[PDB]
Amino acid sequence: TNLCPFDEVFNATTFASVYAWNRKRISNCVADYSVLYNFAPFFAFKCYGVSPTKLNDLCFTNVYADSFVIRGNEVSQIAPGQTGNIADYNYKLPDDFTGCVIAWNSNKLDSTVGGNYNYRYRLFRKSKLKPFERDISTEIYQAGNKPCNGVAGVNCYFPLQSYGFRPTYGVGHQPYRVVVLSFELLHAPATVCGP
Amino acid sequence: STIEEQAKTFLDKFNHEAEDLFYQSSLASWNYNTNITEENVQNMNNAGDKWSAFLKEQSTLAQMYPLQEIQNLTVKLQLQALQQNGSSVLSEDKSKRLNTILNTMSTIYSTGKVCNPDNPQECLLLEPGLNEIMANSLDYNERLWAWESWRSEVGKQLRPLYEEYVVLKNEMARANHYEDYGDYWRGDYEVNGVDGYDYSRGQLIEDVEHTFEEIKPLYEHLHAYVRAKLMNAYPSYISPIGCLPAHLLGDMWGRFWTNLYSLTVPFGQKPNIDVTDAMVDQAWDAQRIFKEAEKFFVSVGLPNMTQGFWENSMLTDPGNVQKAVCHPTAWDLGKGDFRILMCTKVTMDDFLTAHHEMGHIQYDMAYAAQPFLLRNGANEGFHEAVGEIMSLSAATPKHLKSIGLLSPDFQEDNETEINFLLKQALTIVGTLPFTYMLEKWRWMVFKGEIPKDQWMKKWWEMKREIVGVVEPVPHDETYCDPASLFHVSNDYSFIRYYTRTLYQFQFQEALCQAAKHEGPLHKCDISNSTEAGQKLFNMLRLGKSEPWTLALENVVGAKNMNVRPLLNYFEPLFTWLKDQNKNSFVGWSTDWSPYA
Ligand SMILES: *[C@@H]1O[C@H](CO[C@@H]2O[C@@H](C)[C@@H](O)[C@@H](O)[C@@H]2O)[C@@H](O[C@@H]2O[C@H](CO)[C@@H](O)[C@H](O)[C@H]2NC(C)=O)[C@H](O)[C@H]1NC(C)=O
Ligand SMILES: *[C@@H]1O[C@H](CO)[C@@H](O[C@@H]2O[C@H](CO)[C@@H](O)[C@H](O)[C@H]2NC(C)=O)[C@H](O)[C@H]1NC(C)=O
Ligand SMILES: *[C@@H]1O[C@H](CO)[C@@H](O)[C@H](O)[C@H]1NC(C)=O
Ligand SMILES: *[C@@H]1O[C@H](CO)[C@@H](O)[C@H](O)[C@H]1NC(C)=O
Ligand SMILES: *[C@@H]1O[C@H](CO)[C@@H](O)[C@H](O)[C@H]1NC(C)=O
Ligand SMILES: *[C@@H]1O[C@H](CO)[C@@H](O)[C@H](O)[C@H]1NC(C)=O
Ligand SMILES: *[C@@H]1O[C@H](CO)[C@@H](O)[C@H](O)[C@H]1NC(C)=O
Ligand SMILES: [Zn+2]
């Protein structure tokens, strides 16, 4: 039996940034919900649409795993119907989202003295993201009426800022690795489910 | 895009950046304060320069959003903070001269030594030596020698510098669209824009005189009592109808009358309330003290301390290998980092200082959600007010009984209450006239009502008429007596102490009324009162987002400063002073001087 490889999307070395969240497909496998309760400390295991207990005896079409790390006081924005810098400009979920959100503290391997400026988020954007959309653009945000012509300067700002995690911040500024799972059902026959 | 969006975006980018730079500066300063080493000094100096450079650059980049097109009052205070010009309005030569004058005055104050008329190799400085003489000596001549020497071998060297400093600061204030430097200082209390909560810069003065008029009688009675009991230690040196000489007040400048408790004790026989022996015999340490103080704050609804507070903070002297500055301070590094640096010992004073510092920490934690520039007290007199009001309840005998100290069959007599009230009055009520006189003198000097050739004459006339203190030796126009104080040699404000002293008792009265307390106000404990915690937290969380008038109204229900709560606290002492002063003269005469 080919088990679902939920061992590389939950235990990788380096996770993606907020503005470049990775998406890995999981299909044609057998569920391993038991090992999911490893890494016992969970800051959140909120689920939507379906109950965690009944997720075992359910067959779907495709399961998507999205991974990124956000600060402590911003985990609340990973949920339907939320507004904020993370929700509007980085990651948006639909109002009818079905799945679970998993978050746990990571201030042991995602922080360093001096600052971990390898994780960055989008701060300014002209529009607001529609649900499930990425944007790896790096143009200069025009905050005025005079064109910037792709350089920095008055009323022209770089869109991406860097967190700078340090291992002495609080439980709201400390890093938190967040993995969200989405369940979709299509006209194709259901295959992704265990015994 | 209107100016509103352009200002909002600029502030939104400034407030991520400032957070990182301030954190790294605060971490460097904390590392220096824990380890006094050359490498740490280098890191502190190298990290406290990027902050200044970035602040100046953003202030220069924030002058293009005029404050008449912006209509949000939350974005108009950040721009007010960021648009201050300071000393940048001056030329390069003027700024260099001002910095040199300030540094020279600070150096002369710090490294200042007076030397004896006797053998000239052994001679002292202020700390220690010139404070031990002023605090623990009963000789009339030695105190006079110290008082005259400090103002003779230091005061001469600041007047030529203070003249140019006054001129340059007035020119800078006028260039920054003000009236003088005193108006610049008063601008902290200025509120405009919000209807019904305005406060002009000139109204602060009038409020100060209005409060001092009501404060006058209690201070006059206390002055008469201190004069009456101070004539026993100096039988032939104090006039029954005159003013108290300046070198007999228990302090170098007479700021506090605390060191007169040994000479002016109401009932000497009865001890005071001390729990040092009880703490020692119960095996108490710094951890126990801070846990009890934490339980005190938990009892009123305020939250716990952060887990990082216990691990990242130093509460005991490291020892001999490490060298640190043993000054009790509360640190708000930002981004969730709260630390307390204090060399705790097993003493009642440290027990109260722990509550004071944790009150500061709670105040800092309250407004962590506000923007960076608004993360401060509403005015310059709330942080100490909160500390003192939270410290006051800890010294009550009932709270001591609650925490298992002091025997549970203690008889709280009606004489230890008088002793405690007089001890509190010697340090709370005896400093308001001094602060008022000093601030009024500096304000009049800045405005120009006092010409340059009348500084000392006006200073001594004001001290004689307001405070009730007469100089022991005549002073000409060559001395500069006010500059001998730390807060005058180093550029600092002084009315914040008066303002905080009036604020603290208003806060205490409001919280005790909210706690359903019955009896005298000085027997009040706010423990086990959720309402008194919510009422305070409603103001603690605002920060600078709202004017100080609204913040004061949110707690005390009033609109401005008041002195009735202060005089209610000292009411039994006031009645006792009337009872004891029946056969004495209440008041002083300006004419009498010791050298007349
Ligand atoms: C603050 O209150 C605690 C808890 O007391 C309880 O809650 C009160 C509101 C009231 O309803 C009491 O009757 C309750 O017992 C006090 O702690 C108790 O103190 C008494 C002293 O008589 C002691 O016998 C109990 O064992 C204590 N309970 C504990 C430690 O859990 C505390 O003394 C109060 N602090 C004050 C009044 O300053
Ligand atoms: C701070 O100082 C700068 C100059 O150092 C001021 O900028 C000038 O202000 C005057 C005032 O009318 C204008 O005429 C100039 O056009 C401004 N720019 C320059 C380059 O001179 C600035 O206004 C000052 N800030 C405040 C709050 O007064
Ligand atoms: C996660 O990876 C680490 C690194 O080798 C390993 O020690 C640990 O056992 C892994 N945990 C799981 C649940 O796979
Ligand atoms: C002021 O700016 C803040 C910043 O978001 C905004 O929430 C608030 O609504 C603004 N005030 C008004 C009256 O619109
Ligand atoms: C504060 O800490 C104590 C002991 O750690 C705990 O019992 C209490 O529940 C905490 N308070 C809150 C509000 O969590
Ligand atoms: C502080 O102590 C010494 C210098 O006194 C220093 O070498 C050491 O690294 C410091 N300890 C810390 C930072 O924990
Ligand atoms: C204290 O109480 C006693 C007993 O009533 C009374 O005689 C005395 O005047 C009161 N005041 C003082 C200061 O002792
Ligand atoms: Zn304080």
Provide the 3-class DSSP secondary structure of residue A37. coil
Distance CA B102, CA B264 (A): 40
Using CB atoms, which residue from A143, A154, A172 is nearest to B336? A172
Torsion of CA B10, B13, B16, B21, to 10 degrees: -80
> Domains in chain B: how many in total?
3
How far lies B435's CA from each of B99, B212, B497, in Å? Answer: 26, 11, 7
Residue pair B395/B352 in contact by the 8 Å Cβ criterion? yes
Does B294 share its domain with B371?
Answer: yes
Q: How was this structure determined?
A: cryo-EM
Does B240 share its domain with B310?
Answer: no
Name the DSSP class of B463: I
Does B213 share its domain with B300?
Answer: no
Closest-CA residue in chain A for B11? A155
Enumerate the β-bridge partners of residue A153: A156
- In this structure, what are the phi and psi dihedrals at residue B330, rounded to the nearest 5 degrees? -105, 125
Residue pair B196/B560 in contact by the 8 Å Cβ criterion? no
| Catalytic residue (choose from B487, B517, B531, B571) | B487
B371 residue type, one letter: P
Determine the distance from the C-alpha atom of residue B181 to the mean position of all C-alpha atoms in its chain, rounded to a whole number. Answer: 20
Is B156 a domain residue? no
A162 lines ligand 3 (CB under 6 A): no
Provide the 3-class DSSP secondary structure of residue A21. coil
CB contacts, 8 Å: A170 with chain B: 306, 308, 335-337
Does B534 share its domain with B581?
Answer: yes
Say if A44 is an interface residue toward chain B (CB within 8 Å). no
Does B465 share its domain with B545?
Answer: yes
From ligand 5's centre to the CA of B366, what distance in Å? 18
Q: Which of B84, B111, B137 is the last residue of a domain?
A: B84
Residue pair B570/B397 in contact by the 8 Å Cβ criterion? no
Q: Is B472 annotated as a binding residue?
A: no
Is B188 a domain residue? no
| Domains (range + CATH), chain A | 18-184 (3.30.70.1840)
Distance CA B541, CA B539 (A): 6
Distance CA B567, CA A6 (A): 71
Distance CA B386, CA B383 (A): 5
Q: What is the DSSP string of B218-276?
A: HHHHHHHHHHHHHTTTSTTT--TTS-EEGGGSSSSSSS--GGGTTTS-S-SSS-----H
Say if A125 is an interface residue toward chain B (CB within 8 Å). no
Provide the 3-class DSSP secondary structure of residue A105. strand
- In this structure, what are the phi and psi dihedrals at residue A48, rounded to the nearest 5 degrees? -130, 145
Q: Which of B84, B110, B145 is the last residue of a domain?
A: B84
**Mutate which: A117, A123, A169, vs B, most B CBs within 10 A:** A169
Per-position b or e across B94-118, b if 16+ CB within 10 A of its CB? ebeebeebbeebeebbeebebeeee
Does B337 share its domain with B460?
Answer: no
Does B350 share its domain with B436?
Answer: no
Distance CA B576, CA B221 (A): 10
Instruction: Examine the residue annotation and report whether B399 is marked as an active-site residue of this protein.
Output: no
Does B318 share its domain with B433?
Answer: no
Distance CA B221, CA B469 (A): 15
Determine the distance from the C-alpha atom of residue A65 to the mean position of all C-alpha atoms in its chain, rounded to a whole number. Answer: 9
Closest-CA residue in chain A for B332? A169
Determine whether A125 is exposed, middle or buried from the number of CB atoms within 10 Å of its CB (0-12, 13-18, 19+): middle
Distance CA A147, CA A156 (A): 9
Is B222 a domain residue? yes
Distance CA B222, CA B219 (A): 5
Distance CA B482, CA B155 (A): 8
Name the DSSP class of B483: G
The tokens for B584 are 């004495």
Torsion of CA B390, B392, B398, B404, to 10 degrees: 70
Determine whether B425 is exposed, middle or buried from the number of CB atoms within 10 Å of its CB (0-12, 13-18, 19+): buried
Is B185 a domain residue? no
Is B123 a domain residue? no
Does B380 share its domain with B507?
Answer: no
Residue B482 burial (CB count, 10 A) = 21
Residue pair A79/A93 in contact by the 8 Å Cβ criterion? yes
Q: Which residues line ligand 5 at a C-beta cut-off of 6 Å?
A: B 298, 303-304
Say if A148 is an interface residue toward chain B (CB within 8 Å). no
Q: Which helix (H) or strand (E) holds B170?
A: helix B159-175
CB contacts, 8 Å: B307 with chain A: 171
Taking an 8 Å cut-off on Cβ atoms, the answer to whether B13 and A123 are in contact is yes
Q: Which ligand is nearest to the CA of B12?
A: 4
Distance CA B374, CA B281 (A): 46
Distance CA B76, CA B66 (A): 10
Largest CA distance in chain A: 63
CATH of the domain at B382: 3.40.390
Count CA atoms within 13 Å of residue B368 on its CB side. Answer: 17
Nominal resolution in Å? 2.7
Residue pair B338/B310 in contact by the 8 Å Cβ criterion? no
Sign of CA dihedral B212, B213, B218, B219: positive
Q: Which of B355, B360, B362, B356 is nearest to B292 (CA)?
A: B355
Q: At CB < 8 A and 24+ separation, what contacts does A142-147 make?
A: A143/B1, A143/B5, A143/B6, A143/B9, A143/B10, A144/B1, A144/B6, A145/B1
Distance CA B566, CA B429 (A): 9
Does B465 share its domain with B574?
Answer: yes
Residue pair B32/B99 in contact by the 8 Å Cβ criterion? no
Distance CA B522, CA B180 (A): 41
- For chain A, give percent helix, strand, coil, nearest 5: 10, 25, 65
Using CB atoms, which residue from B1, B5, B20 is nearest to A164? B20
From ligand 2's centre to the CA of B60, what distance in Å? 10
Instruction: Examine the residue annotation and report whether B16 is marked as an active-site residue of this protein.
Output: no
Is B9 a domain residue? yes
Does B244 share its domain with B294?
Answer: no
Distance CA B549, CA B207 (A): 13
Using CB atoms, which residue from B17, B307, B336 is nearest to A173? B336
Count CA atoms within 13 Å of residue B11 on its CB side. Answer: 23
Closest-CA residue in chain B for A157? B13
Distance CA B82, CA B59 (A): 5
Distance CA B275, CA B281 (A): 10
Closest-CA residue in chain B for A142? B6
Q: How many CB pairs under 8 A join A and B?
A: 45
Q: What is the DSSP string of A125-147?
A: -SS-PPSS------PPEE-SSS-
Does B533 share its domain with B441?
Answer: yes
- Domain residues for the domain of B10 are 3-84
Is B145 a domain residue? no
Is B137 a domain residue? no
How far lies B124's CA from each of B110, B112, B128, B149, B484, in Å? Answer: 13, 9, 8, 11, 16
Taking an 8 Å cut-off on Cβ atoms, the answer to whether A157 and B13 are in contact is yes
Q: Which of B84, B112, B129 is the last residue of a domain?
A: B84
From ligand 4's centre to the CA of A137, what distance in Å? 29
Distance CA A64, CA B550 (A): 51
Q: Is B210 annotated as a binding residue?
A: no
